[PDB]
Structure formats: structure tokens, C-alpha cells
């Protein structure tokens, strides 16, 4: 309802993918969401997003990614249970290879676009979930996200 505010937090994973390579789908991380609700039936809605894959000890070459974004907004509720929310903002990956002795990073920024709900099984709680979608030149990620937190 108008004045009230919701935040989450929620598991992110993202699948990575450049034409003529195996898609990853290990990059894992967080996501932090806000709302707030101008009136009855439209807000607006803030979303922080990282994922990464970095050193994992295991049983030549060793690699490192990071991805974050910030997006945000329009949320509108549908009735009392569910609203639906589109996302627009910046995504920003990070490479790196190493080996022995010598390495490579790639970084860029781009577009991020979203789209999500947020479901209130009771009217202070929350449960969000969205996917994000950004191209990074040659290299597309997109990014899953379920999360929880309050209404107030």
C-alpha cells in the first residue's frame, strides 16, 4: 500500500555465455532489492545484483569473474499478493585469466534489463524473484534472483 517500503535479500546465479564457448552457469552471488510504494497501486523499485566465480581450490590456466548491476524501476501491484516490476540499468562484468606467472582482464559496462515480482503471503512479508539480462560485447549473462525480506 502507499508509504510502504519492502527489502530483500536473495541468492543470485548467473549463466555466462560468448558464442564459441561453453556456456558457464557457476557465477554465484546476491542480490539486494527496495521498494516503495507511492500509492496503492504503483512504486518504484531499486535492485543491487553481484555474482562471481573466483579461485575454488581443486582436485595451466585459471580464470576469475565478476559481475554486478544496478537497476531500478516501475513496480505495479496487481492485488494484494502480487505485483510485477520491469528494470532498466547498468551491468558490469570483469574477466581475468591467469596462469605461470602472467595474466589478462577484460572489463565493460553496459545496459541491464530486468523484469520480476514480488509476492506478500502476508502483508509484511516479502518474496521477490527477477531476471536480469545484460550483453557485455561479445558476452551474455544473464541472472536469476529469489529473495525474501519485510514490508513496513
Given at each position: 500500500?502507499?508509504?510502504?517500503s519492502?527489502?530483500?535479500?536473495g541468492?543470485?546465479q ?10 558457464d ?23 543491487f545484483?553481484q ?13 576469475d569473474?565478476?559481475?554486478y ?29 591467469s ?13 541491464a ?7 506478500n ?5 516479502v ?17 536469476w534472483?529469489?529473495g525474501?525480506?519485510?514490508?513496513f
Amino acid at each position: 500500500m502507499e508509504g510502504e517500503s519492502s527489502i530483500s535479500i536473495g541468492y543470485a546465479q548467473s549463466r555466462v555465455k560468448e558464442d564459441g564457448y561453453k556456456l558457464d552457469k557457476n557465477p554465484r552471488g546476491f542480490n539486494l532489492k527496495y521498494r516503495y510504494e507511492f500509492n496503492n497501486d504503483w512504486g518504484v523499485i531499486g535492485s543491487f545484483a553481484q555474482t562471481r566465480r573466483g579461485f575454488e581450490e581443486s582436485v595451466l590456466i585459471d580464470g576469475d569473474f565478476k559481475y554486478y548491476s544496478v537497476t531500478a524501476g516501475p513496480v505495479f501491484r496487481i492485488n494484494e499478493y502480487v505485483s510485477l516490476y520491469g528494470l532498466l540499468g547498468a551491468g558490469h562484468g570483469k574477466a581475468k585469466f591467469s596462469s605461470f606467472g602472467q595474466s589478462e582482464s577484460r572489463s565493460k559496462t553496459s545496459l541491464a534489463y530486468g523484469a520480476g515480482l514480488q509476492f506478500n503471503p502476508h502483508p509484511n512479508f516479502v518474496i521477490d524473484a527477477s531476471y536480469e539480462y545484460s550483453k557485455l560485447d561479445d558476452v551474455k549473462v544473464g541472472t536469476w534472483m529469489l529473495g525474501a525480506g519485510y514490508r513496513f
